[PDB]
Amino acid sequence: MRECISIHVGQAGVQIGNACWELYCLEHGIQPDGQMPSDDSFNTFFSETGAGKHVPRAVFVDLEPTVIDEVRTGTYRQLFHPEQLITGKEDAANNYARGHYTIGKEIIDLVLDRIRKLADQCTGLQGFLVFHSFGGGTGSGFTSLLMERLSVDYGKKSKLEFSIYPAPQVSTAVVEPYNSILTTHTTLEHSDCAFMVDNEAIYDICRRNLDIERPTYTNLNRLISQIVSSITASLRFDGALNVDLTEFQTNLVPYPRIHFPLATYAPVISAEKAYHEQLSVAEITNACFEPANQMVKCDPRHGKYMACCLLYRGDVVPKDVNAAIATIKTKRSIQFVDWCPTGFKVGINYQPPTVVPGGDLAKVQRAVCMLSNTTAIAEAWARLDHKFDLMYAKRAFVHWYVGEGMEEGEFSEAREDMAALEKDYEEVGV
Amino acid sequence: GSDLGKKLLEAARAGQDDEVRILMANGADVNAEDDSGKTPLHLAAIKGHLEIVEVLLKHGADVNAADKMGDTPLHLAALYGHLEIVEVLLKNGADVNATDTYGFTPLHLAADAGHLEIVEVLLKYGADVNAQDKFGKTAFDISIDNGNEDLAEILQKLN
Amino acid sequence: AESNIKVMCRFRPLNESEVNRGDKYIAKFQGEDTVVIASKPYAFDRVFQSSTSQEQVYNDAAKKIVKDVLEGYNGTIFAYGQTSSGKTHTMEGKLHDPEGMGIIPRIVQDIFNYIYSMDENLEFHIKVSYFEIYLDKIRDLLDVSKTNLSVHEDKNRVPYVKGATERFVSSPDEVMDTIDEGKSNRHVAVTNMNEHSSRSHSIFLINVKQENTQTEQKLSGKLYLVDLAGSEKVSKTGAEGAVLDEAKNINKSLSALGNVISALAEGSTYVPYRDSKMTRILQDSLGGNARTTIVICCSPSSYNESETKSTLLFGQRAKTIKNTVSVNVELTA
Amino acid sequence: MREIVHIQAGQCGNQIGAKFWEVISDEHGIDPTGSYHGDSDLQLERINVYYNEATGNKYVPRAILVDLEPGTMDSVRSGPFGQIFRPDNFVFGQSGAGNNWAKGHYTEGAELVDSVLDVVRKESESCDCLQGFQLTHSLGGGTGSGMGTLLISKIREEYPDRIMNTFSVMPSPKVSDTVVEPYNATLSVHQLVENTDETYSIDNEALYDICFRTLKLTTPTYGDLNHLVSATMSGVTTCLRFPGQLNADLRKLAVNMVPFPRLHFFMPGFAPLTSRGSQQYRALTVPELTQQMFDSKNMMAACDPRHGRYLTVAAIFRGRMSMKEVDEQMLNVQNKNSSYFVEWIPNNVKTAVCDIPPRGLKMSATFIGNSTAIQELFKRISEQFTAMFRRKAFLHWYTGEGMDEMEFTEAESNMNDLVSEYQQYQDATAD
Numbered sequence A: 001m002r003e004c005i006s007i008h009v010g011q012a013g014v015q016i017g018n019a020c021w022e023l024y025c026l027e028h029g030i031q032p033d034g035q036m037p038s039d040d041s042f043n044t045f046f047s048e049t050g051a052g053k054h055v056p057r058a059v060f061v062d063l064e065p066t067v068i069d070e071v072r073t074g075t076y077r078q079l080f081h082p083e084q085l086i087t088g089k090e091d092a093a094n095n096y097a098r099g100h101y102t103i104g105k106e107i108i109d110l111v112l113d114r115i116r117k118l119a120d121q122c123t124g125l126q127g128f129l130v131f132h133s134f135g136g137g138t139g140s141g142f143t144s145l146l147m148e149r150l151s152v153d154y155g156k157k158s159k160l161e162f163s164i165y166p167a168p169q170v171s172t173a174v175v176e177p178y179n180s181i182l183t184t185h186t187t188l189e190h191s192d193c194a195f196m197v198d199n200e201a202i203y204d205i206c207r208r209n210l211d212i213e214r215p216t217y218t219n220l221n222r223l224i225s226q227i228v229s230s231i232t233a234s235l236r237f238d239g240a241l242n243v244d245l246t247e248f249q250t251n252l253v254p255y256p257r258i259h260f261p262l263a264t265y266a267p268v269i270s271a272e273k274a275y276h277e278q279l280s281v282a283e284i285t286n287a288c289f290e291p292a293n294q295m296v297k298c299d300p301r302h303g304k305y306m307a308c309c310l311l312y313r314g315d316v317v318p319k320d321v322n323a324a325i326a327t328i329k330t331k332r333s334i335q336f337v338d339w340c341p342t343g344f345k346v347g348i349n350y351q352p353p354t355v356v357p358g359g360d361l362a363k364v365q366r367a368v369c370m371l372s373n374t375t376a377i378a379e380a381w382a383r384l385d386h387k388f389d390l391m392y393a394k395r396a397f398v399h400w401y402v403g404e405g406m407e408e409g410e411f412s413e414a415r416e417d418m419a420a421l422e423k424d425y426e427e428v429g430v
Numbered sequence B: 001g002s003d004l005g006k007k008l009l010e011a012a013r014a015g016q017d018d019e020v021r022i023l024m025a026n027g028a029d030v031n032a033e034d035d036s037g038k039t040p041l042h043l044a045a046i047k048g049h050l051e052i053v054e055v056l057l058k059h060g061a062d063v064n065a066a067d068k069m070g071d072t073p074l075h076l077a078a079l080y081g082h083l084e085i086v087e088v089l090l091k092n093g094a095d096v097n098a099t100d101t102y103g104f105t106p107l108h109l110a111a112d113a114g115h116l117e118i119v120e121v122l123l124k125y126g127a128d129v130n131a132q133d134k135f136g137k138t139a140f141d142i143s144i145d146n147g148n149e150d151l152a153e154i155l156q157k158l159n
Numbered sequence C: 001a002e003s004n005i006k007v008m009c010r011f012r013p014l015n016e017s018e019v020n021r022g023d024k025y026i027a028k029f030q031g032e033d034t035v036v037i038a039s040k041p042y043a044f045d046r047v048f049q050s051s052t053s054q055e056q057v058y059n060d061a062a063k064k065i066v067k068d069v070l071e072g073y074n075g076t077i078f079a080y081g082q083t084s085s086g087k088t089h090t091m092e093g094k095l096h097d098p099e100g101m102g103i104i105p106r107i108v109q110d111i112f113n114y115i116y117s118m119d120e121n122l123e124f125h126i127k128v129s130y131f132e133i134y135l136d137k138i139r140d141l142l143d144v145s146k147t148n149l150s151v152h153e154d155k156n157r158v159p160y161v162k163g164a165t166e167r168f169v170s171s172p173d174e175v176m177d178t179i180d181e182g183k184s185n186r187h188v189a190v191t192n193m194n195e196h197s198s199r200s201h202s203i204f205l206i207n208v209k210q211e212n213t214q215t216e217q218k219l220s221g222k223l224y225l226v227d228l229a230g231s232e233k234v235s236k237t238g239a240e241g242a243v244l245d246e247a248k249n250i251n252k253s254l255s256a257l258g259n260v261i262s263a264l265a266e267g268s269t270y271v272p273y274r275d276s277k278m279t280r281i282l283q284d285s286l287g288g289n290a291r292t293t294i295v296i297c298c299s300p301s302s303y304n305e306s307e308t309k310s311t312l313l314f315g316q317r318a319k320t321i322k323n324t325v326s327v328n329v330e331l332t333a
Numbered sequence D: 001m002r003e004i005v006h007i008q009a010g011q012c013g014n015q016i017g018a019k020f021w022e023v024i025s026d027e028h029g030i031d032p033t034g035s036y037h038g039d040s041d042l043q044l045e046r047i048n049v050y051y052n053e054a055t056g057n058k059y060v061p062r063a064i065l066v067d068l069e070p071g072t073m074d075s076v077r078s079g080p081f082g083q084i085f086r087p088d089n090f091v092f093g094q095s096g097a098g099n100n101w102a103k104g105h106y107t108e109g110a111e112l113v114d115s116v117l118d119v120v121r122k123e124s125e126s127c128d129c130l131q132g133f134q135l136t137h138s139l140g141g142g143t144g145s146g147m148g149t150l151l152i153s154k155i156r157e158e159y160p161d162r163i164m165n166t167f168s169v170m171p172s173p174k175v176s177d178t179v180v181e182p183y184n185a186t187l188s189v190h191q192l193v194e195n196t197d198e199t200y201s202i203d204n205e206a207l208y209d210i211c212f213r214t215l216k217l218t219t220p221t222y223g224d225l226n227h228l229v230s231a232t233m234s235g236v237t238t239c240l241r242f243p244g245q246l247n248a249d250l251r252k253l254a255v256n257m258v259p260f261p262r263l264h265f266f267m268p269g270f271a272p273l274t275s276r277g278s279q280q281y282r283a284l285t286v287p288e289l290t291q292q293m294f295d296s297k298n299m300m301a302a303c304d305p306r307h308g309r310y311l312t313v314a315a316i317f318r319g320r321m322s323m324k325e326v327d328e329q330m331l332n333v334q335n336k337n338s339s340y341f342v343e344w345i346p347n348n349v350k351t352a353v354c355d356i357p358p359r360g361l362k363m364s365a366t367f368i369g370n371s372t373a374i375q376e377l378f379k380r381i382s383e384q385f386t387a388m389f390r391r392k393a394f395l396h397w398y399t400g401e402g403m404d405e406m407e408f409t410e411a412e413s414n415m416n417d418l419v420s421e422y423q424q425y426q427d428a429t430a431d
């Protein structure tokens, strides 16, 4: 019934997966051994065994073993079956070409064989949720290779991404802009909808809202997990809005290439906030239109909306929501493209957002996640494209990719595709 | 010669002009030897310290003192290309034709090092152009072996 | 006296693979020198349409290089292009078919035909070498024992492959026997892009040395005749295993060739000739003393548009590079 | 990948190599018998990068000890950690190379090379996932330089897909009187430019200058110079040896540090600079570490970094400190000194913080720079080389060993091109 297969690629993808699956278990009342004392929509993400154990419909892949070794030794080692945790020996060394060709082509068949085994257990497979970074050799190269191979094996089946956009505060490779552009070009025609998560936006929210002096991946992932859970709650719980993967595309994607929605989450409150009580529906809704709560750094006031979805969770009443949307209409200079229905799409789940016990986030009575397709997101591509241009003009580090069987033409091709994408965002809502 | 000796060798190789003068006055042995048999004069001849070569010789250093390999300061200033030191040693009684343990003469060493002006000065002072090393090589044979045309022309007339 | 590198573009008819799929002939041609791809004109020294013959290519590209080599100059002709654009076809061809042979067998003939015409009191001494750069190693194509030859510098700091089989030829027949021997050692594999994909960079070198019995005058000419392997996307070639390892190396030496050209057209004070072995062999052809002609090969298929564009833009860049060509002395100080 | 294969060649190579093994064994809590007696699980997490686990509780360095002279091997065995090494991994000749690169590269070295490769093949084939090789040697002698570079080429031929890393000690007249050192260094640099992926340029000129000028040691010894080398070697390998995100292996380091293949010569730097077994305490602050680590006085290569531009930099902080303070201080240095970092390589400075400080210090910093100023080191060698070569001095010592004069011309040409390439990127603009 309506299954969704999650694929976690490379370090970022695997570590975000750990945070997501930990949170899903807490949300559905599933214990770390797969047992639940609590049919139901969570079955789209968890299969059930004869022994009453609930197993994530997921595959974890990394070309090096260390990150996944933590999953198979950690809390949650009994949650996943060993066959769904796949590791090689040598990583892609922050090189897209090693991920896509040299190293990736060694494990691709095995990964497809494991996804095939998971798909065989599905009666109504909707498609795939792919988690990866843009910057890593596996996250970039292996993901693009996997995306191409999934289009061959699954045809028309929906594929959504959760992509980690690089930030220098936490970057590990000088070549991240190259890896980002190459993966974006290769994956573009294979992805239906992609939610970019800018590590700088998350880093700044952790610093500003959670009073974390120096955010670590642990801090970033707990916050990322909260946004992912909001986006996937529509699939894992019984709603009206974005109940399936096809509904994501219909509601957020007006043009095939313009498939990058902006997520805005509110409220993000520190566990140390002691007297400061509960935020209203109006307050949390207003917070969605402020750039500081965004998952990607960009300015929507400088852009045009082409689709808007508000996903509320907890103590929220429809009368409170409509009142909030109406005031937003009279307030903020919120412009929609001329060729579009100027209207929001509202989702309301009565379960308040769940927080991980020793986490940095406070438990709130009501939260909201706004998903918006805005031309302002083109600013994130421009930042990345400029860094690419600076290095590429000198062919700096190019030898590393060419050595692994890539052609220089692939760099030019990828960059021209990015230039056409920037041109598309400009043309859209002229 | 004790603490003063190690300090004199150090000062001579470091080119500490004043510090050499002080140690002399304090009674440092002019011919105090290092682990290799080198005297402050050999060290000053290696490092190219002219003023030190002169103070040492004025304070009665042994101009022909041979180290453990049998090299005199003349062999060393010739090898290291110190023209002015080669002229100073020669003016103070250096053995033009001194032989080390390898059968080398300062002329073999200046030829092998390719120091034309040193060869010209060694010959002026009586360097034996016909002298053979333990490899059975003369300064001229070294010159042709190294492929030094300029030098081979210079030595051909005599040899 | 100087004169820029001559760059000449040759389009081949659409292949079976192309035809047996959609593929539109994307090249449009204005005059004898311009090709137009996507309303952008790319102009060269002479553009050959798909219909152009092997004798037509020869007459407009080389033939001139034969006079020059004989006169004491250095000549270089190399075919640049994407996988299966016609590099080996232009250069080698049907080695023995009179109408079907390439540039190399035609040069070999016209070398001797011109010589028989030359001054009776002119002593010629022709030696030839044939080698490949397979897997970034200089393998001799006339000695199978010589598998890793080294690029060295001459007195004038001019690189050359030291120790290749130098064979003294006296007749065109003597040369063809050795080209036949060479070809039949040259690495070839099967890519989805080309059934007989060249897997190495073929370097044929004619070394003509002439002395006049009366003038006591000596002349020398190094003639480089390079059939390069083609740039290839794995997506297109289907290159896997040893075929891909071959590809890794082709793209590497090739991006380096581009870097050398880029550098020279931009006039950057450096030029990274020391990057690929190939780019050190061509060092003279590229900045200095050689009259160079580059034959750029293109596939008029819509499938290969991106790549055809990148080959044209290399051509454009390359055409600007000014050589410092003079006569070869063979002097004694 | 996991395993690194270490090779120690010649006197300098073996002395600096032995010091490396005693410093890192102490950091990983390994005693001279091979037994782990430490008190932290972080010490053993990546122990397999440098050590093989033998029968029982014992750890054995994946190290091969090479010399054409036997004496150095005896000195290593007699040393503090001498007994830790695999006895069968000591590969020694009886002759020596007499400070002649040709004897090391073509003659005596060639006679010993296969015996060495036999031992490197054994260590390499035992690896589950070989990262590559780490060679310690000097460029001024005969064995370390000539045989060391011969080994590099031979190992590369058999392991072309593995990383080749060296700790190459550059000669200086300040520490050695050997006349032919510029020849040996130029002939070696020619080999390194073509055959290594990454080379740490450890300059004896800089080591001597630090000991004399900063440490106020009137007459420095190899013991004094080696104390700075071992601090550097510990610092530059911290990322490989402990769990971490940045430059965690030899290939990731190369990808981050090497924008152009030939420009793989690093200028290492360290702070605080200390003399041998001297207390100490007072612990440097983060702004102090940040300032000191980027200063010409703290560079292990005798080049002024302010005379060039950084293509890439790797900075490693060790000890318990504020990661916020490190980030602020690191950003300040690159905002204030914008002009010393190429504008066309964005975010080219990468920082790592390791909780484990080296022994004797509470806080330390290690800098690895790919700076265009390294051309100053190569120009110094080239000037010394040409002065000798112009007069064809000592040439028959090399040609007599079968070498051709043309290798000297070719080596010199290659080194000058390297200088010319650094200059090009020094002057390059983003525009």
Ligand SMILES: Nc1nc2c(ncn2[C@@H]2O[C@H](COP(=O)(O)OP(=O)(O)OP(=O)(O)O)[C@@H](O)[C@H]2O)c(=O)[nH]1
Pocket (backbone or CB within 6 Å): A009, A010, A011, A012, A013, A015, A016, A062, A063, A064, A091, A092, A093, A094, A095, A133, A134, A135, A136, A137, A138, A139, A140, A164, A165, A166, A167, A170, A171, A172, A176, A199, A217, A218, A220, A221, A224
């Ligand atoms: N948010 C977040 N970003 C991460 C995490 N781990 C890595 N990243 C980011 O992802 C990029 C590095 O890519 P990785 O995922 O670590 O690398 P990889 O996919 O394993 O690929 P290779 O190691 O090169 O084979 C950088 O931008 C990091 O900041 C994580 O747990 N959370």
Ligand SMILES: Nc1nc2c(ncn2[C@@H]2O[C@H](COP(=O)(O)OP(=O)(O)O)[C@@H](O)[C@H]2O)c(=O)[nH]1
Pocket (backbone or CB within 6 Å): D009, D010, D011, D012, D013, D015, D016, D097, D098, D099, D138, D139, D140, D141, D142, D143, D144, D145, D169, D170, D171, D172, D175, D176, D181, D204, D222, D225, D226, D229
């Ligand atoms: N830093 C350092 N340099 C050394 C050491 N031993 C020798 N050297 C230097 O290495 C060069 C001499 O080479 P050496 O290693 O003795 O020759 P080999 O045994 O034939 O390789 C000179 O530049 C010396 O200054 C040492 O322990 N430490």
Ligand SMILES: Nc1ncnc2c1ncn2[C@@H]1O[C@H](COP(=O)(O)OP(=O)(O)O)[C@@H](O)[C@H]1O
Pocket (backbone or CB within 6 Å): C011, C012, C013, C015, C050, C081, C082, C083, C084, C085, C086, C087, C088, C089, C090, C194, C196, C197, C198, C228, C229, C230, C297
């Ligand atoms: N101008 C041309 N006219 C007709 N056929 C051609 C032409 N150029 C190439 N071909 C054919 O195309 C194929 C591939 O050419 P080839 O030269 O071998 O490839 P590459 O460019 O990689 O060296 C061969 O079968 C060849 O005969």
Ligand code: ALF
Pocket (backbone or CB within 6 Å): C082, C083, C084, C085, C087, C088, C193, C194, C196, C197, C198, C199, C228, C229, C230, C231
């Ligand atoms: F013959 Al090819 F690339 F296919 F040179």
Ligand code: ALF
Pocket (backbone or CB within 6 Å): D010, D011, D068, D069, D096, D097, D098, D099, D100, D141, D142, D143
């Ligand atoms: F030990 Al050597 F030259 F062989 F110093």
Ligand SMILES: [Mg+2]
Pocket (backbone or CB within 6 Å): A010, A011, A064, A091, A136, A138
């Ligand atoms: Mg990884």
Ligand SMILES: [Mg+2]
Pocket (backbone or CB within 6 Å): C087, C088, C089, C196, C197, C198, C229
């Ligand atoms: Mg061909």
Ligand SMILES: [Mg+2]
Pocket (backbone or CB within 6 Å): D010, D011, D067, D069, D072
């Ligand atoms: Mg020794």
